[PDB]
């Protein structure tokens, strides 16, 4: 399957490529008609990723509640506490996807890193358990190591992540 | 030209791929003999990157002094103040390379992002000028926007970055 991305106002070819961890050239190859530039509201294909819309899992993040809630077909399966971004470095809101992952990243990333479709952002573990449940991050979503391990064992790449205030 | 990487103790195929923002498959293709695994101290090729050793620029970072010093053939050309990592999220030390860049990343990244060859780390600008000169970062090296713009205009991808305490 293919992932379809809805172009947003402000997006540039450069910024979309960075968000999905790909080259503008690869983005252009998968969408030859982009040879004439971008348009807000149009849909385009992101090469190399699975179809998010066949995946029955969905993740909902509440910045205010400091929770990440995993659902399977509208049924809530898990709820985890999280750290979110501080005021000058907030966690971004909107519709995103998990696009890749790295086991054992270590350092502040703890036991697992899951990339989100915003450049430089992800869901990860932590070396500072006291930080969980607080707005103290650079923007990434932090989880207890045991929790990010469990989350990663359940959801595949392509999984939708919706982030709300 | 080709970039040659010196395998370090602790490196895995997964971790090297992540550090250089590539797939293990691509890493394996560029180094067919790795089909038998890794060995600390051996040298391997990282595909798709320029040769760092033809570039006459060299960047030296001092965590203690909070400086980034740019040299051209052993002659110091610029010295900039920087923010570095706090105690639980320190800036890593060792030999790295600038491997790609993104203009206008915005948010905490400010005017420019330059990727370093350690997964998730880079040199970037800032939306918080007061942070420069302090050990308050997640590990990335922060610069004043005007300074990262200037640095990026001078040095090419592949440029060596040596980080010392």
From Swiss-Prot, chains A, B:
Coiled-coil parts of chain: none
Chain ranges of the L,D-TPase catalytic domain: 57-164
Signal peptide feature range: none
Assembly and oligomerization: Monomer.
Entry comment, domain topic: LysM domains are thought to be involved in peptidoglycan binding.
Miscellaneous note of the record: Regulated by SigK. Could also be negatively regulated by GerE. Transcribed by SigK RNA polymerase.
Similarity comment: family membership: Belongs to the YkuD family.
Protein's UniProt name: Putative L,D-transpeptidase YkuD
Gene this chain is encoded by: ykuD
